[PDB]
Design a protein around this ligand. Structure first.
Ligand SMILES: Cc1cc2nc3c(=O)[nH]c(=O)nc-3n(C[C@H](O)[C@H](O)[C@H](O)COP(=O)(O)OP(=O)(O)OC[C@H]3O[C@@H](n4cnc5c(N)ncnc54)[C@H](O)[C@@H]3O)c2cc1C
Ligand SMILES: Cc1cc2nc3c(=O)[nH]c(=O)nc-3n(C[C@H](O)[C@H](O)[C@H](O)COP(=O)(O)OP(=O)(O)OC[C@H]3O[C@@H](n4cnc5c(N)ncnc54)[C@H](O)[C@@H]3O)c2cc1C
Ligand code: SF4
Ligand code: SF4
Ligand code: SF4
Ligand code: SF4
Ligand SMILES: [Ca+2]
Ligand SMILES: [Ca+2]
Ligand code: NA
Ligand code: NA
Ligand code: NA
Lengths: 101, 544, 556, 102
């Protein structure tokens, strides 16, 4: 599922126009909010849309999540992924849009 | 509430893989056609492709023919398929892959199938091509029923979840491309992770339910596709080496054919017989191989990365555990959905269908869904040539649908929420209609209980109360799935044989039966409020 | 926070069936003894008896003897019980039933004044107020009670137990309770595995969902030995509401049937409790379910008697019948299995004790569902063990005085451990989240409902490592009030119990108890395993260590 | 599980001293509240304790509950159970404390 880090969120609204479940909306104060974190499919569309990495994906503790998180920053030609393990160690993985696997 | 009447030539319900290609193909055929897509979410990412794709699975290498594809499809499921649908899909698989490249999908070399892709943005590129073609799109708009006039579909009703609007959309022809149905059974992890599943949790059978309510015929709901995927995160396995049980034995070697159904069946046996869990044996791959895997999964199923980080799993040292999903009602990887003719016309005049919502042809994949959208829209374009949207819809019929759509919003007496009824339904189906908890096995006595329990859920729908238009969407997802579930139970009750292992496990009739080499179809009778089963004979494809 | 130091002679942890009778019996022996019960909830209704009970299920009806009781209890384990414990319970069952009558329990009597038998070893009662009656008798004996007070650890001086630590959930108070002897009567453990209906109905289960293994965990942390955690009792009960079946089966004499109407127990040589459950699982797996108790054809008066009986001990079933339009005279009653529980009443898991119910720690005694070795105990057997334990504890305290002095650093250490998540500003998980995580691990890898109770070595090895990772994350829990602090300690305790369960299941390489201990990779019973598998917790290594204890013939 | 009918509750607190799970407490305004309805065992101790029948037991919809409810009135020598089905039909059953079954 995902969490919105409201202190980082700049209220741009971009994450509210991507979700296949319509789960994200902009509150009156401008911040984004998820309707119900239990309904998230973990498609990461919102994570990649946020320009300030205020959205992070994490695995529900109820199914074994231990606090690792995934954030994503879109560049002109790539997605830079920031993976933070459960002890805070960060790994940065850049995947060029034209890179094929 | 503002009621808006819209007019279009071609109305497409659902802007996913099949609906986008249908709309693009329509504009390519006739630039002057008015084409409107009604999409529940946001077309840039909506549907099964939201997370990206691992590969383009279905196209033909040099020397392969549609006949080769038909035989593969029969080997991957059974001999009882709609050969005419499979063959006509096969003729266009390669053309559909070429269009994806034209639209901007990154592709590189290393036969033809040996390509490297980045599927991360497959849906955005498809959506961008759709809008560039001049297609009009109503996003965040939920279709709720077809507009019927004299047994002919001439449009659809829909409501917005971002504005206080109800749409009466008149059209010369309608194409259903809503995908299949998930969320009928309990998922692998109910509650906190209830939408961590293989199929889209936002494809909730709307197309099936609108079809059934309008009188259209469905087929083969007893064939419930179950996905074998990485445990808990439900990530693809194609990316990731052989299958092993917990003893390290390559248990597939015990079976003659290594087909998708066989891999699931074999894995269930290993677990049931005390040799699980089962895994993909990634042990021994290189450090660079691990990095490649991480980059690929980030582009189509990122949750697995978090599982590996949390559980200290390095695939070169620890194999990847796999298991089966809930059963889904789909016509992409399975063969459940609308009954259509070779031109993808449903049993209702004016209504066509394409993609995971159409039954009879399993192993469709993205290219196959795109191809079906083209076939359907080509047929619809020929059908609308003569006519015009001059149909007059009585205000009373409009008011009737409005009352039905918004009923729980005005229900001060309601006592249940959509979420409560959804869970109740999923429990019934899991326990009495062959869910995970029964290892997918069904028997007559439990199915008869499921039939009666679903009717009692249906009775309680009128006791649902919602507070906003988003919760109203959830109500309609539940209304739709209850009807689909009632059809599934009737299909499962009727086929007294086991034709598809795992996907249709009739434990009380465990053998395949030559007397059952026919299609089991259903129709919803709105007068008696009952599902009616129709038998359709199998026909060899012989075009002349 | 108020740190309250209390001195007592006999400290009883848990004011349930065994704890109440232990306390009453103490005051019978010596009215001047200071006896104190620490009770997590409200003694008037606390523990497994909260809803009432369907009958007294351990009573020696005419012709029955303690020796024949033992012979019957032995059968399920193929003789692997602590016969000394069972026999000494058997000698007191009828006394305990008479005590319940003296306290005010209505027990049906015939014209001669004999209790009315319901089965071979059960008698008919109105059990709705069994716990209030026991609690009233306890308070009338002069026993002191701290309600809404959660025990967290024993006080140990060297290797001797001399009290316990507890915290209130209604006052900002922490208790240091010094005692000459302690009796652990906390019951067993539920909530280690996933229940039948996780989420909305997660506490609809057979065993009390509020008995979460505190006694097992306190004993393990203090160095005491546990026994036979691999024998996990599973209840065959009415589906979803988890209601008793004895009232329908024993009271009406109805048979178990599959959905075809066949009496499937006739296919099995022995119609025992574990086989009734095993046979039901087979019927369902092989496509002949659901299974039911066949009430079809009973009279309208019998239906009324059933409704009144179930209202008095499991009222939820009445609501299911009304919602689903079930009249038992027309529709049979669907049955199914529960989660596995770690219990010493209906099962034989718990503390390892001597015949006097002394644990392996000096100063610590135990009684009831927390004590292993002797299944088929029931409410009278638990009461009997309470008496045996307290009698021995009183003899032991005769010499000593409450002159033991605890060191302030030790008190401070427990306070820091007990209140840690309340002060954890940086915490990121809730007790509920971790509880669900643990239940998933156990359900999937240690033989829960989802695997039809089956376990294998490979899955158990995974469970061992996953539980260790959960324990590492306990330090990341935060709680916001004392009620949620109690829930944190329930999780902490259950994790330790689960780790022990896994080790026991790993160690016993045979299948001795069908359903309750299904090692599918060792599917046969093995005479070389006719011995007890015990465990202790090593605090230096943070690991559970297995100890084998030989079976000893009991000769009185 | 159970629900507190706040319009009926008189804020007496009696229901807060029986629950084996410590689930019921008195809020600032005196009325009873359940900490988490998912943690209820359906033992009915609170239902019986409430002198004005402001506590009713019902089965969770998520497991098939359809709205039937149970309330209970303690008398000097009995419990009077009030059973209302999902359509509002009411059945009242008194079980005398000294009455034994079968
Ligand atoms: C997780 C996953 C991974 C996959 N990976 C691959 C792969 O690597 N390669 C491959 O070839 N295939 C893959 N597939 C298969 C492929 O994605 C599907 O077969 C295909 O996307 C289905 O196309 P569709 O048009 O029928 O449905 P979809 O693409 O899902 O589109 C359905 C549309 O209908 C909309 N909708 C639903 N209800 C309503 C309503 N009431 N009103 C309006 N709109 C509505 C949805 O929002 C959606 O936009 C994958 C599928 C899944 C689920
Ligand atoms: C649903 C059910 C129905 C039954 N029906 C019958 C029947 O009809 N006939 C029959 O003979 N037997 C019956 N039994 C068995 C009998 O009820 C139990 O064997 C017996 O009550 C167990 O007694 P106990 O003292 O060990 O545990 P309990 O009576 O459950 O008491 C344990 C006490 O410990 C307290 N406690 C727990 N943790 C802590 C902590 N950290 N600090 C302080 N206190 C704590 C609890 O709150 C509770 O008061 C039934 C049991 C159950 C579960
Ligand atoms: S990860 Fe996907 S499903 Fe979840 S909130 Fe973001 S866009 Fe929606
Ligand atoms: S995209 Fe990011 S910064 Fe913009 S509203 Fe969403 S969370 Fe906030
Ligand atoms: S029914 Fe029992 S468990 Fe539920 S809140 Fe009332 S007293 Fe507590
Ligand atoms: S016992 Fe009844 S009236 Fe009294 S506080 Fe509780 S719910 Fe309210
Ligand atoms: Ca859902
Ligand atoms: Ca719990
Ligand atoms: Na962390
Ligand atoms: Na290396
Ligand atoms: Na830690």
């Amino acid at each position: 599922t995902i969490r919105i880090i409201e202190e980082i969120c700049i209220g741009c609204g971009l994450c509210t126009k991507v979700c296949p479940g319509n789960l994200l909306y902009q509150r009156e104060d401008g911040k984004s909010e998820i309707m119900d974190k239990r309904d998230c499919w973990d498609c990461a569309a919102c994570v990649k849309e946020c320009p300030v990495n205020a959205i992070e994906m994490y695995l529900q503790p109820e199914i074994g999540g231990r606090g690792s998180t995934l954030k994503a920053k879109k560049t002109d030609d790539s997605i830079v992924w920031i993976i933070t393990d459960n002890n805070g160690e960060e790994e940065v993985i850049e995947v060029k849009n034209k890179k094929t696997f | 509430m503002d009621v808006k009447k819209i007019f279009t030539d071609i109305l497409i319900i659902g802007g996913g893989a099949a609906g986008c290609q249908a709309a693009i193909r329509a504009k390519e055929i006739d630039k002057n056609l008015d084409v409107l897509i009604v999409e529940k979410a946001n077309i840039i990412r909506s549907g099964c492709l939201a997370a990206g794709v691992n590969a383009i699975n279905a196209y033909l290498n040099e020397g392969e023919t549609p006949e080769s594809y038909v035989e593969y499809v029969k080997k991957e499921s059974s001999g009882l398929i709609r050969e005419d649908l499979t063959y006509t899909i096969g003729k266009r698989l390669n053309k559909m892959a070429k269009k994806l490249e034209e639209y901007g999908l990154p592709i590189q070399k290393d036969g033809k199938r040996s390509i490297k892709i980045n599927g991360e943005s497959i849906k955005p590129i498809l959506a961008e091509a759709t809008l560039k073609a001049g297609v009009k799109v109503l996003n965040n708009t939920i279709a709720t029923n077809y507009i019927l006039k004299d047994e002919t579909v001439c449009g659809a009703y829909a409501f917005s979840i971002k504005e206080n609007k109800f749409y009466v959309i008149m059209a010369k022809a309608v194409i259903c491309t809503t995908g299949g149905a998930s969320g009928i059974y309990k998922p692998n992890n109910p509650g906190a992770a209830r939408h961590k599943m293989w199929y889209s949790p936002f494809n909730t059978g709307a197309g099936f339910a609108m079809g059934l309510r309008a009188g259209a015929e469905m087929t083969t709901f007893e064939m419930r596709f179950i996905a074998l995927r990485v445990k808990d995160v439900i990530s693809p396995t194609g990316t990731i080496v052989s299958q092993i049980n917990a003893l390290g034995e390559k248990y597939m070697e015990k079976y003659e054919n290594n087909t998708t159904p066989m891999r699931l069946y074999a894995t269930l046996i290993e677990n049931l017989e005390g040799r699980g869990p089962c895994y993909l044996d990634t042990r021994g791959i290189s450090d660079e191989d691990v990095q490649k895997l991480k980059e690929a999964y980030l582009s189509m199923s990122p949750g697995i990365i978090l599982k590996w980080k949390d559980e200290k799993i390095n695939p070169k040292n620890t194999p990847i555990e796999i298991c089966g999903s809930e059963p889904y009602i789909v016509g992409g990887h399975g063969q459940a959905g609308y009954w259509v003719d070779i031109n993808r016309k449903t049993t209702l005049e004016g209504l066509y269908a394409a993609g995971d919502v159409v039954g009879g042809s399993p192993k469709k994949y993205v290219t196959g869904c795109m191809a079906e959208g083209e076939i359907a829209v080509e047929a619809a374009i020929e059908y609308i040539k003569s006519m015009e949207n001059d149909i007059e819809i009585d205000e009373q019929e409009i008011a009737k649908e409005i009352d039905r759509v918004f009923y729980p919003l005005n229900n001060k007496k309601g006592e249940f929420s959509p979420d409560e009824i959804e869970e109740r339904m999923q429990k019934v189906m899991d326990e009495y209609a062959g869910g995970i908890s029964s290892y997918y096995r069904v028997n007559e006595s439990k199915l008869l209980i499921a039939r009666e329990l679903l009717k009692a859920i249906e009775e309680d729908l009128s006791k649902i109360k919602v507070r906003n238009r988003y919760e109203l969407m959830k109500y309609h997802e539940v209304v739709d799935r209850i009807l689909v579930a009632r059809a599934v139970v009737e299909h499962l009750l009727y086929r007294k044989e086991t034709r598809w292992k795992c996907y249709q496990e009739r434990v009380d009739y465990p053998e395949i039966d030559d007397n059952w080499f026919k299609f089991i179809n259903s129709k919803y009778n709105s007068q008696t409020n009952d599902i009616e089963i129709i038998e359709r004979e199998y026909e060899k494809f012989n075009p002349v």
